[PDB]
């Protein structure tokens, strides 16, 4: 919905609009201090800075949020929520898109993604499964150049008010030169015995649960699985009383 | 095709009109590296804004900048007192090796240009070498020419036998333009152009480029005095509570490289701000 | 697609006129290399600005640069007594490899041309090979000529059995149009062309190209003796103390190449200028010291 | 465009007038390839100038030049006793290969042609395939003709999936014209055209093309006899016999190629000239006489 | 551009007349794709001189080359029982597939056209495609016909991103005029055209063109029974000297290509001709 | 040019009459391609047992042309019935089905490469309804060529005139991402299923007698892998078996005169 340089556009297809996102904060599972710190520091000053611009040149938003934990949707719901809550175009990266066909295609794509994130909207960049930047090669040094360099600060002295979330299952092998520029790092433990109660309450909104017992033992039934199979078991025990109801 | 060329020419012409006076012709390739000429009044951080490190602020000025800009003082020595043909800033990530580049581009008028790694890598066979040539030719036509390459250990590197061809002959044209046959002038003038580059590890940049960058300034972690300077410098416009003292934060901060200091200080600046939301 | 043609042709014509007046009809592609002929007046350094390479300079001059200029003196063994196909200046980086090229292009007398490796590689298919033949055609027209390709190891190389196509052809074109079916003449004169190249990585150029340039001069680091003359060559203009032991400087380094010595001399000469500028004196002044460190 | 093509056509017409002597009609494509017809008076190295390898010369002559040129003696044989499709001269770099093609151009008198690989690859699209068809449309208009492609490892070679798509056609147009549908005549003559290809990397030469050139002559480095013969041949023009002992130099040179023996002869042949110049530099101006002497090389 | 145009038109008129006679006016633009119309008599090889290959040589003669030539005896069927449009002839190099193409052009009966790769690739923009239209329109003007693209792996090929879009347009033009919207007639005849192919490798020709030509006959390496006949069928005029045990060379060759078996035979055939070196002696 | 305009007049008259207006010569060349309705042999029933995608066609694209969206892309892999579906559409459309023949677009002149596309759009708008079917649109509309590509979708957005364009590319995710979303509907043409393969077999085996081989029910059990064209090729190879055997038996003697027995 703006002027096109074409190379970056090979990225505009991934630019999710800030509206019509399924975020709906009440639906997310039990996560209090994580959402608290995000809504206080990453998205609160990311918009309406006039309630926040009392101190200039230092109250920008921290350009990097690292979400590390077990494999699951815990590192996805908050990321999708940040964009819809900040009036933010969720410009996903789609890491496999950075694969090399031309000699400098990945380099130009990494340039265009930051160019669009600076020009299009200050919303966020999302790098899921961060392993392209390990720490052991052109694109790796291309990130840290465009991230915080000569063109990062504007004439007013404030940064480009852009955030780049960090999604990865691994830690402490993430190219520490890049880990340095992801200030706010959040350990998100997907397995939760109390958050699972809230997530099951969210799931059972439309599901009929008259005969089955009150939602207590569900908080310990799949105690082993953290967040994924619980999302898959939403229909496991759901249709179980539903086969006989559909046939007759 | 032609429309894109004319549009890039309009960009370069406007950029030269805005940069020259605080217009010259160009070919197809330096017409693209001409979009990297950084205006000095754009980066709002100079030598007065970097803290802790002062000798590097001292060595970058009299040994490099003054020999480059207004060298008429350095005319007593004809060819030997010219400016150092290259500079490199190496150290652990977190210090201000890229922040020094901002100060050099802001508080030293030298026709600063920074070529990104994307400007060098090109799809078509041979365009990368021509881009390097265009860079070193614009650096001559426009020649205080403090060229910058951030993370120079990536576009350059210790070449192996099985290195990619397109990256193995752009390291060669780069060197051939840097101190090649046509480097000096007719009267012996060394053609003042400094290639300032940052890097986290001077271990695989090259064995023939490290000789080219003699002024290699290591940027170590700030000490007990440098941390105090950085704290007193980054809290200029922030709230000043009468109770806390900076020496406590500086003494407790053992490591915490300058970027880490800035981060842990920005995080501390949320104590009074969050309380206003409780209304 | 024509104005660039006119610009390149006028530049090539002016450059060739300059080289000719120092003492003619080119096609579309010979103009691309015609604007790279380096004139002797342009290069300021001669052979007298190289220290310690007096032994290598003799074998690089009397054997390849003066069977090639005035070959009338070498008329008895006209077949054998010709300029070799090329010199390979190989060695660790920072010692005379490009200084010797400068000296040859200045005080050679031959139609020197700097190749500017970007000129070899063109985006269009079948264009690098056209330039590779145009450069040798221009060298034959500029006979005698001394082609120079700094850092041979980039454009050339062991040809990587599965690798790029155009770069494989542009590298297989030197092999064809430099000692090929039409290198010699009707009498035996091999075109009086020498392709001199300076690379800091020997045994990576080619197995079939190291047979082409037979004269390969190793350029090592200076020793205890010729550093004493490299220091003298570098410190030729700076007014000095009546006594500073250059024996100490030449004997203490012991492991630094030519550029590493030039940098030390630069710092030692920058010391007094900085010490004088520290006195907040705006205008120039012709007096200072040279005291060693 | 016409102003340049007219001069081109005039130049190739002059070249063909010089070559054909003891007025063809040419289109634009195989016209510019007429600049490469190498006259026999332009290569002063016959088969009496290469020594050592003789079976390669013998088999080369009596299996190509006698079949290719002078076919009337091979007429009654049929289709078998005819010139082979092509020839591959392979081996280490710097021994005999390019110097065998020189003798075939000077000695065969069979309308030799030097391909000049760059002329194949044209910048425009579908202009390299036209030149590939043109080199065979001109090889047969002045048959017999020997098509020489020096260093057949880049323009040809193992076809891959990730080709340029512009060299894959020149790599396929060539083999479609050189052993294709309309090569043989109405009677069954295979065009009397030979493609001699010299290279040093045989295992990357488009193996489907290796079926085209059957006569593959290995050109190895010289031995105890070939080294001495190359020494005798390269040192012809030199007053070298005060106490010359070439039997010793032939054994000293262990395994260097034929061209390295030549460079050694060069370095050992101009040493006395350097000595004479250094002795005469004391006084006078160089007016060198015929009195140096060759004694011992390195 | 007209005098050379007149030369092209005159030469193509002569060629088309000599092919047809063993009347039609062109548009001067398909006037150069008709220059590859191979004559019937200028191909010295036929079907009776192909030893070894017998299943392929019969499948061509029965199911491809002869639903087309003399098709009136297939009128009992409808859309089926027609000549299948497309042949591949894939196999290793030098095993005798261009020889099969020669034999088909010599003893087929349809107007064989030896369409090269250059005649399809034109320098000007949007002109190579119209040359494709000219090729298929010429095949449709007289429609007993067998188009032949030798080595179909470069002019065709698996299309990638970019890769000279004006070239992928040519493949799209091929497979659009192949069986597009105007392939059949009002009755249902499949245009009466068959395109013969040839290629050392079928792995990247296409996924669409790979099925455009249904019959993909593999020509393998000659075995014992095939080499034992090729080695005897290559020796037509060579005077067989006495005591020549043919069975020895047939087995000692040990699975050699179809052309290398020709070279090994030419060597022995020219051995005595070269031994006739007495004339030099005298 | 006069011959071109004359042939165009004849073809457009034979199309329209089943009232003609002469127009510009540069707009006169594309009008040499107005295919007649009785020229195509195939009908809807000739297509196999798909009868769902063809249902969507007959329910949405042909009703407004008797509004209809602009842009109908075919999706199936090679050999599934894309060109067959487009042929049935051209035969029973009722509009004036005008193809392209992509070479008609690409002219080797500066001011003709887009004049021809403007001519195509002007002819489609002059007589209504119409269809601008482009065989394998992944070639003329890809990722002067730029002028044509831009010229196309600029004239794309032009009662909304009742023009509908239909593309029949055989490849997805490599085709005209700009104009891809601009055309609303895209119809995936999958491979034949059980009932689908049964319909293909029962429709192809129409002229030949009912005993070419064992039976048709058994043959439609192993055709799950092959596409819609390979099944036709296997069917025709099977049909050639009786004719092959009869001709081989007749080769012994007599003149090969046609007979009505396998
Ligand atoms: N000495 C200092 N004084 C003031 N601020 C500093 C200092 N050192 C670091 N900083 C702060 O930390 C950040 C330094 O980022 P910089 O561009 O130097 O990273 P970098 O050195 O390029 O990282 P890398 O070495 O991994 O490339 C800046 O935002 C700056 O405000
Ligand atoms: N023998 C010498 N005498 C005088 N100066 C020297 C000598 N060797 C090196 N230098 C100095 O080094 C610089 C030139 O370096 P040079 O071009 O020889 O390096 P190089 O061998 O080309 O390295 P590379 O091949 O990696 O480019 C000059 O500024 C010159 O003053
Ligand atoms: N048999 C020989 N007799 C005399 N001189 C020879 C012989 N073989 C090689 N030479 C010498 O070698 C040089 C030519 O080498 P040649 O052309 O054979 O190498 P090449 O095969 O072209 O190598 P490449 O193809 O790898 O470049 C000449 O200078 C010639 O004097
Ligand atoms: N059945 C055969 N009878 C006689 N000669 C054969 C036969 N098969 C192959 N040959 C020989 O093979 C040679 C070339 O065969 P052909 O041209 O048909 O293969 P090809 O099409 O060139 O293969 P490719 O093009 O894949 O390399 C001919 O000279 C011919 O003598
Ligand atoms: N459902 C079906 N019913 C009847 N015939 C079918 C069916 N599907 C495919 N066919 C057969 O497929 C053949 C036509 O193939 P088609 O034209 O659909 O390929 P295409 O997809 O257009 O090719 P491309 O993928 O290259 O565009 C016809 O002979 C037709 O009989
Ligand atoms: Mg940095
Ligand atoms: Mg150098
Ligand atoms: Mg050679
Ligand atoms: Mg063949
Ligand atoms: Mg189709």
Numbering used by the authors:
A (entry chain F): 86 to 221, 231 to 342
B (entry chain E): 44 to 65, 86 to 342
C (entry chain D): 42 to 64, 87 to 356
D (entry chain C): 44 to 65, 86 to 361
E (entry chain B): 44 to 65, 86 to 345
F (entry chain A): 48 to 65, 85 to 132, 145 to 221, 229 to 243, 252 to 355
The authors write:
In addition, we expressed and purified a mutant form of Δ30-Msp1, Δ30-Msp1E214Q, bearing a commonly used ‘Walker B’ mutation that inactivates ATP hydrolysis but leaves ATP binding intact. Δ30-Msp1 formed homogeneous hexamers as assessed by size-exclusion chromatography, whereas Δ30-Msp1E214Q formed hexamers but also higher order oligomers. We incubated Δ30-Msp1 with ADP•BeFx, an ATP transition state analog that in ATPases (depending on whether BeFx is bound) can mimic both the ATP and the ADP states, and Δ30-Msp1E214Q with ATP. 3D classification of Δ30-Msp1E214Q particles revealed two distinct structures. The structure closely resembles the open conformation of Δ30-Msp1 (RSMD = 0.867). Second, 38,165 particles contributed to a reconstruction of Msp1 showing extra density, indicative of the presence of one or more extra 30-Msp1E214Q subunits extending the spiral staircase. Henceforth, we focus our analyses exclusively on the structure of the homogeneous hexamer, because we observed the higher oligomers only in the context of the E214Q mutation. In Δ30-Msp1E214Q, M1-M5 display clear density for ATP, whereas M6 does not contain significant density for a nucleotide, again indicating that M6 is in a distinct conformation from the other subunits. The Δ30-Msp1E214Q structure serves as a convenient control: M5 in Δ30-Msp1E214Q binds to an ATP instead of ADP and the corresponding WD motif and NCL in M6 are both well-ordered, supporting our hypothesis that the NCL melts in response to ATP hydrolysis. Upon modeling the protein into the density, we observed in all three structures extra density in the central pore of the spiral, spanning its entire depth. This density likely represents an averaged composite of a mixture of peptides from endogenous E. coli proteins that engaged with and became trapped in the central translocation pore.
The AAA protein Msp1 (in yeast; ATAD1 in mammals) extracts the tail-anchored (TA) membrane proteins that have failed to be correctly inserted into the ER membrane. TA proteins that escape this reaction are mistargeted to the mitochondrial outer membrane (MOM), necessitating their removal. This proofreading function is performed by Msp1/ATAD1, which extracts the mistargeted TA proteins from the MOM to facilitate their subsequent proteasomal degradation. Here, we present a collection of three high-resolution Msp1 solution-state structures (an ATP hydrolysis-arrested Msp1 mutant and two conformational states of wildtype Msp1) that address these outstanding questions and begin to explain how particular features, shared by AAAMC proteins adapt it to its particular roles in protein quality control and beyond. To obtain a homogeneous sample suitable for structural studies, we expressed the cytosolic domain of Msp1 lacking its 30 amino acid N-terminal membrane anchor (Δ30-Msp1) from the thermophilic yeast Chaetomium thermophilum.
